[PDB]
């Protein structure tokens, strides 16, 4: 289309898509900056997933620790 051009939103995205292109079979334009970015990005995605699940479970767990020691003991306190 004068010319066939493709956009990526950022530069690490350019590096990740060009790395995926090189793995798929695109000719280049072992090694210096790769795959430090791949290792850090994979660990970064692991951080994201683990933080999501741990936030969900602590969000599920802290109502139990505010119910058991405060509300239930206050209930038995006002009871007897």
């Amino acid at each position: 289309y004068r010319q066939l051009e493709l956009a990526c939103e950022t530069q690490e995205e350019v590096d990740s898509w060009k790395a995926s292109f090189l793995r798929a079979g695109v000719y280049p334009e072992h090694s210096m900056d790769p795959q430090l970015e791949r290792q850090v990005e994979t660990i970064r995605n692991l951080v994201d997933s683990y933080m999501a699940i741990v936030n969900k479970t602590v969000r599920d767990l802290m109502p139990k620790t505010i119910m058991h020691l405060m509300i239930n003991n206050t209930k038995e306190f006002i009871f007897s």
Binding site: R2, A7, W17, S20
Partner: peptide
């Protein structure tokens, strides 16, 4: 292997206009 939204810069009349498509990258296509 890798799918993701990526934008084409120059787009013909038959395709449409400026748009971010969903690219599906495979080891062959």
């Amino acid at each position: 292997i890798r799918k993701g939204w990526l934008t084409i810069n120059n787009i013909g009349i038959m395709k449409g206009g400026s748009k971010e498509y969903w690219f599906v990258l495979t080891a062959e296509n």
